[PDB]
Amino acid sequence: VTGIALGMIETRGLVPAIEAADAMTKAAEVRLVGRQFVGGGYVTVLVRGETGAVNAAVRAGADACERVGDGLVAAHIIARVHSEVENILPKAP
Amino acid sequence: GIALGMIETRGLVPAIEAADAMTKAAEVRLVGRQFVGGGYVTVLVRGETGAVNAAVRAGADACERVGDGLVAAHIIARVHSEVENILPKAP
Amino acid sequence: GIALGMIETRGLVPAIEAADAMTKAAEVRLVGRQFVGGGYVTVLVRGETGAVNAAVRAGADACERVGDGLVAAHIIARVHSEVENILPKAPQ
Amino acid sequence: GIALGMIETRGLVPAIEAADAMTKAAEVRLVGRQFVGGGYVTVLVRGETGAVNAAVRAGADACERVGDGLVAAHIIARVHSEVENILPKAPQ
Amino acid sequence: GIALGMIETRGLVPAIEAADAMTKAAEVRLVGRQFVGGGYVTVLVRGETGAVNAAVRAGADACERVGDGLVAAHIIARVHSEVENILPKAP
Amino acid sequence: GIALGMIETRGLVPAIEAADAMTKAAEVRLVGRQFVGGGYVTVLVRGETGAVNAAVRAGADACERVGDGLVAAHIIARVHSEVENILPKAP
Amino acid sequence: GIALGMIETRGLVPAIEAADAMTKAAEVRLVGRQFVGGGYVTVLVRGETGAVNAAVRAGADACERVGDGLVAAHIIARVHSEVENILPKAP
Amino acid sequence: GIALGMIETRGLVPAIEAADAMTKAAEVRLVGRQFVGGGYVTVLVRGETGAVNAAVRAGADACERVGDGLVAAHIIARVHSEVENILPKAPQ
Amino acid sequence: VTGIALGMIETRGLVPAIEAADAMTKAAEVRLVGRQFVGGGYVTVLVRGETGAVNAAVRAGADACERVGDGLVAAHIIARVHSEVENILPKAP
Amino acid sequence: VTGIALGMIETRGLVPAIEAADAMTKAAEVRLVGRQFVGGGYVTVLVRGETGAVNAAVRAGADACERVGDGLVAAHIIARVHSEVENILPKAP
Amino acid sequence: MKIMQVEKTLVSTNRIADMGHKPLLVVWEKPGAPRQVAVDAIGCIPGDWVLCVGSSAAREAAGSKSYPSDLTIIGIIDQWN
Amino acid sequence: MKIMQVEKTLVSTNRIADMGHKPLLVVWEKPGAPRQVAVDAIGCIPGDWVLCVGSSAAREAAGSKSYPSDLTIIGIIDQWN
Amino acid sequence: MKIMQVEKTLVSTNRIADMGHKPLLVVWEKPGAPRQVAVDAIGCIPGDWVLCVGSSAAREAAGSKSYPSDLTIIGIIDQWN
């Protein structure tokens, strides 16, 4: 898979985060590039790919994970990521 | 087995009880205990679909009252190959 | 020594008090003090079933008052072999 | 490049959005993403004063909506030399 | 200087602002920034009693509105030799 | 298969109907019919977890109205080795 | 696998969505799409009992709102040998 | 070209209008027009994910008014390999 | 007759469809390229020709067939038809 | 320090003016080019530097001096100063 | 108004929300002329000659008083060389 | 609309108050073309090709009925040469 | 928006009443470019590079919903060559 678009989903807990990651990867052709434990319960999953693929993946993941567990906190999409942000974005999980 | 079962609890005692009841109720394989942070603790198992379902049901019923309680209980029949990268193999 | 005793407290002072109370009450070995995060501290012990039960009861009763209080106090008389992989063996 | 820009958010998604917004808005260098703990994420930038001000304003405006929202958005036009010892220089 | 000044803030931005205003307002020495956990961040300084008092007052007045706010601001004129063991020397 | 499914009925006709519907609905193995005494009759099966679940659900739905009715319907995913001593092998 | 899962939908788009979600959620084998006539469309799968159950549940939850909606969702654990004559083998 | 777009309409005129609208809006290939029976007509397209999404949105918006209206408008970004056996490849 | 414009009329039943086709062909200079049985009672008639001719034909056909039988369902006009749609559009009846 | 931008703060009295000058010079990288006694109590402090630096300095100075003493009268910023105004603007204090 | 020829379809996934479902086409006066993107309110295959309106009228031609557009296709020329 | 490529970020400290917090980018059709400044409503790194709207539509694209802008970026082209 | 450089001050005594007290400056892209007059809402010495907005946005930038202007200066570029 190629592309630089980034899709983010933040959930309160690990079970909704895993569900969202699975839903995203099954719905679209994206890449799971990392899972982050923010602290305080927040867990963030990141996906990379084409813009439309990331759009479909993030929509499906938010819809799937909005109910399981404590719920869904945020679901954001970034078309082009600045080169500086790539330093803080993980490459592989 | 490929099916994934998981329970999140608000504490470590309910997580241990859930994992113990899970492994005793069904012949599944405990693959990891994760400290999410903020009090959440998660336990994960792998196995057949029916065994995972029975184990998760038993664990969610056994950890309901122990400790601060139960947060979530989920079952995935066939998880995507991408999620294996973030799923732990051993605890 | 196969039974496992568990006590969870909001803070480290009640956890220390509970661990001391259990260890003084019965002949058990303190195996682990775990910082769950968010204020939860868990103490684990191993021993014969009745001793672990008595120690857990005494520790819960003793450390209920001190600090933010109790969260859980649970005894397992037969830990599954697979579960043992996530149970610490030596305190840190 | 001496001015310092700061944005704090409840969660990592708004923090990433803010960092991207600032970096796209102005010519600044992202120096640090800090996990404060308890849900707070802080992003730091360095650059000329006006550029840092514009970047911070744009980032706050962009990332206010996403996630749990904003916590702080502050610009310092002259960081003291002693304070620099606690400011990270490269992101991790 | 031996006097110790400290401010706790609910976030890292108020802590940085407090430390910056402190060091600019008085000629004190910043000795450490500590992440307590749960959101609290602490900054510590050393110096003369009057300088530390002025610095802490300025920092508490400057971090009051920035971010989530101010938690505490304290001054110790002569800290016991035992507390040096837990007090950081450099950040 | 190791999973155990059982239904108790208040009579022998509902027990026969439950066992028949069970074995027809799922490919399980009927291992015994027990006269508890006082009218209760129990039927037991062994097999895979999913097959046992489907069989027990079908039997509990088929014996609900026939005869005096249904007493209980239970599924054990992995029964302990000790219970094999009291579990019959053949009827 | 022998278990049969089926969903009927009032349209072809909900049927495609149901089949897609089914095959992605569980490792089952899609065996046929049938145009009943009058708008009804049916999709059928074969596989293990647990996999078929998970697939059918996911498909019924995914096709609920898409299109005109969901008509029926059924699972047969062990279908009779006679029904194989009318069950399609490939779509 | 792996994403699949779907539109269902009550009648053949809205189906033709939808197919034309999608094909004009994006670079997609119309693969199938299916007579479901009972008045339902379904049109299928294949292409890159974003193009299929744009085409489906435009077609739904265009053909909502004409005829008896819309029934469904759904985009699948990743069709399973097994599902492909029931998807027509060439229109008739 | 030449042209690529397409005129569509959908009626519930065959009698209104035949009436609409006759009215269209008599009113304007168009080509009857097909009649389709959609299923469920819907019947569709298609005409090809110049844009203005198709406009007049479709207007007259809708006006004529709006009353006979179960009635008129849809009457749409397409100026230029995409090449892909020509695959599903019939050539001759 | 370079730049031609000018920052002005007017206070009623000398104590707020001194406080504002100190706050400006500590907050940003500017130059104190003069203090003027207008008459009637008004005192004006002038700073020079880059546009953004002057902006930050003036904001901080107004915020700091708005309370001490009689208070703050005016706080204005000028991006580019005309060459004629440089005659009346003092060079050094 | 302004006569242009449709070149190709243009798709932007990250377009703003209020742009709606309307499609976009790339239109130029002639091969080699500077290219512009116009909101399609009629439906045009590549190649044909269309009428393009600009300024505030294009917003209404798109469909709303406040549609974010500045060049909208309002019709297809019947005959044109 | 009008296809342009982002060149660099432009910052003006003395900009009027009602311009808000929105950023500004320098956009041109191609290297060497005349340069224009567009209000960024999407977020674009330098180099990519974006859709720029003008006239009264740009004010709404910025975010307000009365935003002082005349050229606003409304989306990023997916594929473009 | 549109980047221009201030050349000189322009004064018109017989200007219409509703133009208010706002000053006018002559702005061009570069020496030799066609000259345009822009209402000054910021205050710019000759020589510097400024941001000029046009169309209906310039009226608001001037200060009123109905100010008779079509090109208003909205800010001064910090750094520009």
Residue numbers in the entry:
A (entry chain D), I (entry chain D), J (entry chain D): 4 to 96
B (entry chain C), E (entry chain C), F (entry chain C), G (entry chain C): 6 to 96
C (entry chain E), D (entry chain E), H (entry chain E): 6 to 97
K (entry chain 4), L (entry chain 4), M (entry chain 4): 1 to 81
How do the authors describe this structure?
The carboxysome comprises a polyhedral shell that encapsulates ribulose-1,5-bisphosphate carboxylase/oxygenase (Rubisco) and carbonic anhydrase (CA). HCO3− is accumulated intracellularly by membrane-bound transporters and CO2-uptake complexes and diffuses through the selectively permeable carboxysome shell into the interior; it is then rapidly converted to shell-impermeable CO2 by the encapsulated zinc metalloenzyme, CA. In comparison, canonical α-carboxysomes utilize β-type CAs, namely CsoSCA. In this study, we determined the homohexameric structure of CsoSCA from H. neapolitanus and investigated how it is recruited into α-carboxysome shells composed of CsoS1A and CsoS4A shell proteins, as well as CsoSCA encapsulation in the context of Rubisco.
We generated constructs that express either the NTD or CTD of CsoSCA, as well as a CTD deletion of CsoSCA; all three constructs contain a His6 tag fused at the C-terminus of CsoSCA for immunoblot detection. To investigate the molecular basis for these interactions, we evaluated the CsoSCA–shell association by performing single-particle cryo-EM on purified minishell/CsoSCAΔC and minishell/CsoSCA-C. Initial analysis of micrographs from a preliminary dataset revealed the presence of T = 3 and T = 4 shells in both samples, which is consistent with the shell population observed from expression of empty minishells. Therefore, we specifically purified T = 4 minishells by collecting elution fractions from ion exchange chromatography and screening for fractions enriched with larger minishells by negative-staining TEM. Despite these efforts, we were unable to resolve ordered internal densities in our cryo-EM maps. Closer inspection showed that the disordered internal density in both maps contacts the CsoS1A hexamer but not the CsoS4A pentamer. This supports our earlier findings and suggests that CsoSCA is likely localized to the α-carboxysome shell facet rather than the shell vertices. The minishell/CsoSCA-C map has less internal density than the minishell/CsoSCAΔC map, consistent with the smaller molecular mass of CsoSCA-C relative to CsoSCAΔC. In addition, the internal density in both maps appear to contact CsoS1A hexamers in proximity to their central pore regions, although this remains to be further validated in future studies. Careful inspection of the HnCsoSCA structure reveals that the CTD is buried within the hexamer, with very little exposed surface area. Therefore, while individual CsoSCA-C monomers might be able to interact with and be encapsulated within the minishell, this interaction may not be biologically relevant in the native α-carboxysome.
